[PDB]
Input
Amino acid sequence: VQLVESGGGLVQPGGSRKLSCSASGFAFSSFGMHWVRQAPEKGLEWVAYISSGSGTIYYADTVKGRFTISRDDPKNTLFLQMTSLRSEDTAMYYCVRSIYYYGSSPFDFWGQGTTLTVSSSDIVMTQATSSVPVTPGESVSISCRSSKSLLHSNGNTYLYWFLQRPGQSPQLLIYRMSNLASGVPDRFSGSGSGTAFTLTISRLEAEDVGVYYCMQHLEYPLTFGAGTKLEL
Amino acid sequence: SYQVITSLLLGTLIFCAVLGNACVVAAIALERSLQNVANYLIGSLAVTDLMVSVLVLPMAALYQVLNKWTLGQVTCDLFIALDVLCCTSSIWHLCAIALDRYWAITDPIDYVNKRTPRRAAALISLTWLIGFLISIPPMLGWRPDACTISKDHGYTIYSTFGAFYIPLLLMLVLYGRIFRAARFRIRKTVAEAKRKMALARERKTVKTLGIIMGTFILCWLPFFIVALVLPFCESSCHMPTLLGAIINWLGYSNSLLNPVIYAYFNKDFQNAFKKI
Amino acid sequence: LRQEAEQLKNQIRDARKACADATLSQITNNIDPVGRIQMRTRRTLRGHLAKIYAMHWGTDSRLLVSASQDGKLIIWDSYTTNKVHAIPLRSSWVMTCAYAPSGNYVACGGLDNICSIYNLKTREGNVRVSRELAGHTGYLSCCRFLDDNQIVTSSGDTTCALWDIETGQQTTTFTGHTGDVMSLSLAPDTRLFVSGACDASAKLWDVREGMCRQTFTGHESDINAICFFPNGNAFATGSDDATCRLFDLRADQELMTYSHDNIICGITSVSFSKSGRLLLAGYDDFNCNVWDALKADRAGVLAGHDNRVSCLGVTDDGMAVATGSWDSFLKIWN
Amino acid sequence: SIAQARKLVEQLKMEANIDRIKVSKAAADLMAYCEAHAKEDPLLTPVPASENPFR
Amino acid sequence: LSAEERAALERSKAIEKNLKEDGISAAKDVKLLLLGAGESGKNTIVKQMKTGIVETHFTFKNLHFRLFDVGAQRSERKKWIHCFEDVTAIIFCVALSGYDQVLNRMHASLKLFDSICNNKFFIDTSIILFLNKKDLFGEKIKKSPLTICFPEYTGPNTYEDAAAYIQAQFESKNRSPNKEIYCHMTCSTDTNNIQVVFDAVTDIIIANNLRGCGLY
Ligand SMILES: CC(C)CCC[C@@H](C)[C@H]1CC[C@H]2[C@@H]3CC=C4C[C@@H](O)CC[C@]4(C)[C@H]3CC[C@]12C
Ligand SMILES: CC(C)CCC[C@@H](C)[C@H]1CC[C@H]2[C@@H]3CC=C4C[C@@H](O)CC[C@]4(C)[C@H]3CC[C@]12C
Ligand SMILES: CC(C)NC[C@H](O)COc1cccc2[nH]ccc12
Output
């Protein structure tokens, strides 16, 4: 499984270019596809979503109308047609693999990303702490707050935890509140209820250094909390 | 007294037609085993006949019992349009059923590979389109306390030949080809018991096509002969207005008899009705 | 040696009659009978386009897999009726399906003589065949996972097999049936399983030893369905002779028969409620009858299928029963 | 052949020498389990529609 | 619904669409159950048309056939014979040169044919009977008479009359009005059994359609 973005580069403000995603190694047609961007110093922000089969398309309000997400299943390619490229559009754009069925793990694989450079009602996820200093071998709990209850009437709490390691693309740790992602050691733990959430790391290694991001998946304008960095 | 007999007879006919057609439609909708292209056409014929029985037959029976149109001229125009629409659609449903049977019996490859419910829907829509194309021209303009259809000679020919005579010729031709195919199949099938059963099959084929075509003809031909000729006898010929009612109600009774021919005689429909 | 075999058979019969002190009906004469178990179709699973032969509930009691002759293994979200997966089988002639207790795998098989193991949870988002278990010389009629690496299959080759899925090899072959083995039931502890075969006998097998501990013979015709009681000390069989029979492992004989004069059709599937007081049996006469497993009383009926109820299953939490049928629908009942 | 009869005899011997319990105790244990779990049997004792996931 | 519930429902709808497409594609297949007994001409007609069940897919005159060869299943048929309840026809292969052989071959074929004809799942299923090895039958009918198999024959020992008697014995098992037995004699060197099965299936479909209209 690998997602390879292309495009990016440097553009003038008001310009246009298409981001591409060369998916390979997985059933790309069966996955919903997201574009999630990260400004050079700020945290993740979800951009657009195209569902499996292209039936459903969503955009962030800040890019809706100007940005167009499209996929080509036969060539396993995901596109982001960007128009009227404002200076606020500079970011590293990540393509995110996500599949949706009962028990599935959305947002489980992320592409390496391409940096786009532009020259010059939504649920809120709050990570009050940031840049918390940690010591290897001892536990740490990363907290998260949501403006609305992420718990749905179905019983699921649509809270996602991602680990953005330094220099590496984000990596899902917990997909629905208290659901460990595949390949994540069973020392990361997720808990909370309603609007308050914590991610506990039991015995943090040197690889757990990184920015940890919340994400709600209850109402669709997916919002990340400002990341909570972990530093040695 | 005398009008009570007419009211009871016509009301019983309307109730029987409504019950029969609604039960055919309900059996189609209730059973997975009756959701077939052929059964879609039969159930659509039942839907059309139920529309006849609930829209035309009550108003026509009111006109018959009261011997006069005690409703509006707008309502009279609507009644004529609905009557022609629904009767033409039922006759062309008979033609569509015959066409589907013809394709099933003479084109098994199409029956397997190309026969889809979209084709049943297309045939149904085409029958209703012909019904509209026959019934709307009088409202668009092609034409006394009496509600009678337009007697325009051009419209008379167009509507009698478009609702019955072209349907009659198509259905006669299709069922003649179906008969020839049925005998070809039986003769190819044919130890004396084998010839016994082949003769029984030919007898069954002639009985089935007799029921189908004889019911259609004895119901609608007496009405449509008069509907074609009598406008051309605008001064000489005078229908007793009892024979006219009789022939019109034979045509209406075709909507009562169609469920019996196409559903209540069907073995599949009988089993499905037993399931309820 | 036929004389010695008959002598041992008579000794077994005598040992079984020595334990037949009071029948199950004599001891359950005083418990309050269940009144009328009136389940209702809560969900109808539509999407199969041929006869459904097998279903198996998930251990989460929410997902279930169904096997249909249309060549599709469909995993259902029974709460929402959502289709989680639709697995296209290489052979459409599937007559058994097993959902792994972990939920990571599903199995299916049939006239191809293969148990195909499907990985439901792959890095690629598609369900693929992880292993095809070949070695049975007859159709596979039942398969049940012990875990992610072990699955027990029953076959029309008259044998049952234990498989190591990683090696794809028969760890144990369970021979001893003379008729086609039609059903399997693992014990809750999964240390031993019962198989019912066309020889009208149910054989109890040790999974590790690989030997037939006990043989149970009360049915007059082919046993199609078998299921342990929830505690694993008894099991119920469903055969073509229109009877269900409850056999105790320790008593080593039939304790109860679930038959009715108005039932003459064969029995396709049996399962127990969570407490095991209800034996739910699927019949050729298109419905599922609910039996008081203790009093043999016909507690209820699950009518609603237009063809033979080929399979049924009770959730591990006991909330719902799903019945599959030849009419291509699965119905969830409460 | 003869080996098949030998195997059948050995299997019958291995099956004949087991510790069978009385069917009275078997039925008593089946009762004990049934009434010991009758409360947690949603099919035996239907749950309120709030607690029924298939509502 | 939740966003994830909505996307799960969308996935379920896509699955339903694919299932409907697959069922539509599958309903266009003419499914044939190939039967017979051992050394009959089952494999010969499979080769002419071209592990426990073998599936031969061929298209002839715009008709897609799925031929299910199940002879490898050496188990009780009635446990899996309902799997083929909805075949267009059964193709039964009988070796004509089996009247003279015991392992009687032709009595076994007749018993199997009777059980298949009078199976409750094949009440109205027509049978494309193939009487195979007609050339070997002609070779061995001039030497030995048709009395080793049928003592009650008492007819001419000629090839045509003996073969007609065998065919009559097989068709005597039909005993059903809604089912026809289409009997063809083959010699393993004739390239027209594909045509024979196509014509028999066409006749079956036409007769089923006529029965639907009440004309059969
Ligand atoms: C409105 C009502 C009175 C008209 C009904 C017309 C019916 C009753 C008439 C018209 C055509 C007639 C059929 C014509 C042909 C045959 C074939 C013969 O072998 C049996 C009689 C049979 C089947 C007739 C039965 C009666 C029949 C079906
Ligand atoms: C089952 C088939 C034969 C039903 C056919 C019955 C039809 C032809 C019969 C039964 C009752 C009859 C009606 C009874 C009463 C009258 C009133 C009279 O002033 C005009 C004729 C009219 C309107 C008859 C028309 C024909 C009629 C509708
Ligand atoms: C009371 C009258 C309105 N009854 C009419 C009868 O119900 C159907 O008459 C026709 C249908 C189609 C085409 C037609 N051209 C002439 C008559 C006609």
Notes: Chain C has one domain: 1-333. Helices of chain C lie at 2-19, 24-27. Chain C touches chain D through 63 residues (CB under 8 Å).
